[PDB]
Design an enzyme around this catalytic site. Structure first.
Site, short mmCIF file in Angstrom:
data_model
loop_
_atom_site.label_atom_id
_atom_site.label_comp_id
_atom_site.label_asym_id
_atom_site.label_seq_id
_atom_site.Cartn_x
_atom_site.Cartn_y
_atom_site.Cartn_z
N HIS B 39 -34.91 -24.97 -15.97
CA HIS B 39 -35.45 -24.86 -17.32
C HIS B 39 -35.75 -23.42 -17.71
O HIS B 39 -35.84 -23.13 -18.91
CB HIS B 39 -36.72 -25.69 -17.45
CG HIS B 39 -37.14 -25.94 -18.86
ND1 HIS B 39 -36.41 -26.73 -19.73
CD2 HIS B 39 -38.21 -25.51 -19.57
CE1 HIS B 39 -37.02 -26.78 -20.90
NE2 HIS B 39 -38.11 -26.05 -20.83
N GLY B 138 -47.62 -23.87 -17.38
CA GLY B 138 -47.34 -22.76 -16.50
C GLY B 138 -47.12 -23.17 -15.07
O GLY B 138 -46.72 -22.33 -14.25
N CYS B 140 -44.86 -25.25 -13.90
CA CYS B 140 -43.47 -25.55 -13.57
C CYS B 140 -42.97 -24.69 -12.41
O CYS B 140 -43.23 -23.49 -12.35
CB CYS B 140 -42.61 -25.31 -14.82
SG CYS B 140 -40.94 -25.95 -14.73
C1 LIG Z 1 -49.36 -29.72 -18.89
N1 LIG Z 1 -48.34 -29.61 -17.86
C2 LIG Z 1 -48.43 -30.09 -16.64
N2 LIG Z 1 -47.29 -29.79 -15.98
C3 LIG Z 1 -46.53 -29.12 -16.86
C4 LIG Z 1 -45.16 -28.61 -16.52
N3 LIG Z 1 -44.52 -27.83 -17.58
C5 LIG Z 1 -44.70 -26.52 -17.66
O1 LIG Z 1 -45.54 -25.85 -16.79
N4 LIG Z 1 -44.09 -25.81 -18.59
C6 LIG Z 1 -43.29 -26.43 -19.43
N5 LIG Z 1 -42.63 -25.63 -20.42
C7 LIG Z 1 -42.68 -24.18 -20.31
C8 LIG Z 1 -43.34 -23.43 -21.29
C9 LIG Z 1 -43.39 -22.02 -21.20
C10 LIG Z 1 -43.96 -20.95 -22.00
N6 LIG Z 1 -43.68 -19.82 -21.39
C11 LIG Z 1 -44.06 -18.50 -21.83
N7 LIG Z 1 -42.96 -20.05 -20.29
C12 LIG Z 1 -42.77 -21.38 -20.13
C13 LIG Z 1 -42.10 -22.13 -19.15
C14 LIG Z 1 -42.05 -23.51 -19.24
CL1 LIG Z 1 -41.21 -24.38 -17.95
N8 LIG Z 1 -43.10 -27.75 -19.36
C15 LIG Z 1 -42.21 -28.39 -20.31
C16 LIG Z 1 -40.84 -28.64 -19.68
C17 LIG Z 1 -40.53 -28.16 -18.42
C18 LIG Z 1 -39.27 -28.43 -17.90
F1 LIG Z 1 -38.91 -27.99 -16.66
C19 LIG Z 1 -38.34 -29.15 -18.63
F2 LIG Z 1 -37.12 -29.37 -18.05
C20 LIG Z 1 -38.66 -29.63 -19.90
C21 LIG Z 1 -39.92 -29.36 -20.41
F3 LIG Z 1 -40.30 -29.80 -21.64
C22 LIG Z 1 -43.72 -28.46 -18.42
O2 LIG Z 1 -43.57 -29.64 -18.34
N9 LIG Z 1 -47.15 -29.01 -18.01
#
Ligand SMILES: Cn1cnc(Cn2c(=O)nc(Nc3cc4cn(C)nc4cc3Cl)n(Cc3cc(F)c(F)cc3F)c2=O)n1
Ligand SMILES: Cn1cnc(Cn2c(=O)nc(Nc3cc4cn(C)nc4cc3Cl)n(Cc3cc(F)c(F)cc3F)c2=O)n1
Lengths: 296, 296
Positions: B39, B138, B140
């Site tokens: 991702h 964050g 991920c």
């Molecule tokens: C509340 N929660 C609990 N676990 C998660 C996992 N998660 C995550 O940490 N981040 C995600 N989106 C990102 C946004 C970003 C903004 N910046 C600056 N960098 C970012 C990096 C990421 Cl990965 N997501 C969403 C998500 C992650 C994926 F790997 C995917 F394939 C689809 C998705 F919608 C997320 O779920 N959040």
């Protein structure tokens, strides 16, 4: 909301094995000092530690990290701990202070056996100065710690004994035993725990922030009324509404509304749950809730 | 009994921050390879990862360990992860393997943010292939691991997404998403969680060994019959009986008695509790019960 531990790497590098004769437990190596429970010099036997200390022989000690032996230079006794001076400083000594916990404080235990860490978990110091850990024989000297935002490790606990109840007792690094339990095999019975009202309030805020709100009382009780009630019903006094301002601001719900809710929920949840709990939970502090929900 | 994590130090030394454009998550650095969720290369929009990969440019990557930036040499895509080759090997790579978890497996999560570990906890892979962690934005790429008795680290999980329910989904290090969820921001709903019967049997043996036996059935239900009941009542099959023989011997209670006890208790305890729980607990594996009570 999940009980977590802070990462253990910086503390693992400080755990050593301390042996005196046949007795083996854990110590904490910082600079050129190893701190460990004084029970390591106990005879196989009421223990007279003053006499065991006066007849101590330095060559009876063995102190080792990862199978490497440190030369023991001197030993002093401070309350329930020993301070063993060694001829080599720990090159992985983290930035650290020593801190004495108060009831309601959360911290991390690194459970160790023969100087080797086996598990890490978060605990809360209860009002009777015990913790509910998981330890078996050999865990004596396992350290408890907190890591501050700047990276400073607070060393706050050295595991000592398990009570007849299963509750766990430790000392701080000055040698004071939390709760002033005796570091002796004895039949001591801890006084009953109170519910940590500060943590229950934090828990209810966490429930509000996860959409769980069936339990919310419409009305309020002030701090003075709650504290009078708490004294009669096994709860601690609540400390200052103002410290919850961040969670009150994010939920629009005042502490007084939660205090009233606690009074209601004391009499039972009635077949419902709050974040998968069937009674009120005092396991999480305000700081833990804020960190786990917002990263702050 | 306490859910605990294995010490995190050796994994902390492998966590990196991986950035592509403005997207930032966590990766794991082993030898000269960083593995992270793919991702990180998603545009800011249903993501066409094949197109994102074909237009990828190595100069858009930034990879760092504790603020030290690593040169990026090449990148390949494998299922839901990237394998990023960097210009130096991690000198702290632990002895390790990759292992794909199965439902009922316990493991450890090191929750990380911006390449920095902040918490560690134990979890169970559930039958719907999700876990119940504590993760915020964050997280991920946060890794899951187990440490074998010989010190080999099994890398088994890379955090991917949080579902609408709050349940958490990750991949293994080969790029297979557990439960074959999509690494997409689409609405996905996991199947119903089943109680892990193997863990409930272990929990009831722990209760017996703690003197809690008010609930014990003298009735016996054999494995085949329990498994047919389990299907219709939200429970997994019990996998086998002989692994419990050490606990059966200490307690004089057969596994078949505990299967009957599960059927007796699956609707609730009335007003009573077992080791403080008000309903059956499937949090603890047999291995955990035996380790935490006997050190084996
Ligand atoms: C509340 N929660 C609990 N676990 C998660 C996992 N998660 C995550 O940490 N981040 C995600 N989106 C990102 C946004 C970003 C903004 N910046 C600056 N960098 C970012 C990096 C990421 Cl990965 N997501 C969403 C998500 C992650 C994926 F790997 C995917 F394939 C689809 C998705 F919608 C997320 O779920 N959040
Ligand atoms: C079940 N449980 C939970 N926590 C504890 C802590 N604990 C412990 O780990 N060990 C203890 N006795 C020792 C035996 C030894 C055998 N060898 C070879 N070496 C040994 C070292 C120790 Cl410390 N105890 C008992 C105990 C420890 C004290 F520090 C004390 F002051 C009085 C005591 F009765 C123990 O509680 N066990």
């Amino acid at each position: 909301l999940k009980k977590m531990a802070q990462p253990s790497g910086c503390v693992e590098r400080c755990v050593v094995r301390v042996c005196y004769g046949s007795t083996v437990l854990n110590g904490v190596w910082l600079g050129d000092t190893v701190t460990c429970p004084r029970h390591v010099i106990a005879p196989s036997t009421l223990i007279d530690y003053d006499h065991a200390y006066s007849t101590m022989r330095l060559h009876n000690f063995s102190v080792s990290h990862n199978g490497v032996f440190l030369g023991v230079v001197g030993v002093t006794m401070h309350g329930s701990v020993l301070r063993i001076k060694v001829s080599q400083s720990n090159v992985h000594t983290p930035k650290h202070v020593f801190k004495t916990l108060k009831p309601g404080d959360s911290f991390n235990i690194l459970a160790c056996y023969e100087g080797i860490a086996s598990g890490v978990f978060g605990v809360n110091l209860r009002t009777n100065f015990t913790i509910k850990g998981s330890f078996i024989n050999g865990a004596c000297g396992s350290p408890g710690y907190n890591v501050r935002n700047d990276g400073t490790v607070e060393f706050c606990y050295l595991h000592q004994i398990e009570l007849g109840s299963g509750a766990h007792v430790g000392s701080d690094f000055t040698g004071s035993v939390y709760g002033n339990f005796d570091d002796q095999p004895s039949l001591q019975v801890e006084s009953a725990n109170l519910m940590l009202s500060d943590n229950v309030v934090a828990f209810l805020y966490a429930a509000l922030l996860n959409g769980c709100r069936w339990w919310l009382c419409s009305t309020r009780v002030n701090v003075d009324g709650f504290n009078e009630w708490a004294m009669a019903n096994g709860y601690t006094s609540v400390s200052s509404v103002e410290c919850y301002s961040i969670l009150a601001a994010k939920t629009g719900v005042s502490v007084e509304q939660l205090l009233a809710s606690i009074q209601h929920l004391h009499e039972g949840f009635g077949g419902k749950n709050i974040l998968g709990y069937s009674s009120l939970c005092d396991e999480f502090t305000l700081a833990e809730v804020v960190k786990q929900m917002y990263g702050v």
